[PDB]
Design a protein around this ligand. Structure first.
Ligand SMILES: CC(=O)N[C@H]1[C@H]([C@H](O)[C@H](O)CO)O[C@@](O)(C(=O)O)C[C@@H]1O
Ligand SMILES: CC(=O)N[C@H]1[C@H]([C@H](O)[C@H](O)CO)O[C@@](O)(C(=O)O)C[C@@H]1O
Ligand SMILES: [Ca+2]
Ligand SMILES: [Ca+2]
Ligand SMILES: [Cl-]
Lengths: 133, 131
């Protein structure tokens, strides 16, 4: 009867998140989320970052939909929006480093790293949920 | 790496299943027992927060709390006593209708007590398996 998210996706605050069980490079992951009409995960709330951060820690490193592939040092979400000042706090100390060599962002432990996009990692999709009358 | 069974949500070392249908309280207990889980027991505030918002999207939802053993004492389905640190979650004006509304539900932003005969959504919880 009342189903908020696709089967095996988790509901959180009006959206549905899918946690990959396997690992892929950054671009593939984008493609993988695209294939289910979703986006490699974009963060725009702290409750979200807290929920996503904890899941990832139990699995391991996990890609999010953030990168500076358009322009070194500028960090864009796949929807084109710029990284907000309110989120810089999520960088781990010593991150981001290796600018121009590590162009994609991952959850790592308790914060974000930038990394070689070529590496395979777990990933996460996000799309909007569907209500119940 | 699979933390929880298919269509179950991982949270802080446990697994959660959200029903798509509604059942009276005792049935819901049964349903949980069918999959080696319990009608949900809260023991953390991050947990209470997650469930609360999830229920909101669906509708009133049962948890594994009741005073069926003894009017006015609220025990979890596992027999454990309700903690002082969690009393804050009763909505204002809850618990009421004591001795007539014997089971606890998520309702809005806190907990109500309700007639156990009512059909409501439910949530099961059981421990996860790591990677
Ligand atoms: C492999 C190595 O020797 N040092 C690595 C350090 C260490 O990880 C940190 O000093 C502590 O973890 O930082 C990187 O991983 C990073 O995030 O870009 C790359 C770098 O090559
Ligand atoms: C006259 C009277 O006793 N009324 C009832 C009230 C009201 O239900 C609440 O005040 C909410 O309006 O309180 C009880 O729930 C309670 O706490 O035991 C039962 C009680 O029988
Ligand atoms: Ca880095
Ligand atoms: Ca009531
Ligand atoms: Cl399974």
């Amino acid at each position: 009867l009342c189903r908020l998210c696709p089967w095996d996706w988790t509901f959180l605050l009006g959206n549905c998140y899918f946690f990959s069980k396997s690992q892929r490079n950054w671009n593939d992951a984008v493609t993988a989320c695209k294939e289910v009409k979703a986006q490699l995960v974009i963060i725009n709330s702290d409750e979200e970052q807290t929920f996503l951060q904890q899941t990832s820690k139990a699995k391991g490193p996990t890609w999010m939909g953030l990168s500076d592939l358009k322009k070194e040092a500028t960090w864009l979400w796949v929807d084109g929006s710029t990284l907000s000042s309110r989120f810089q706090k999520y960088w781990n100390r010593g991150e981001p480093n290796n600018i121009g060599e590590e162009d994609c962002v991952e959850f790592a432990g308790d914060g974000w790293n930038d990394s070689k996009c070529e590496l395979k990692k777990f990933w996460i999709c996000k799309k909007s949920a569907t209500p119940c009358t």
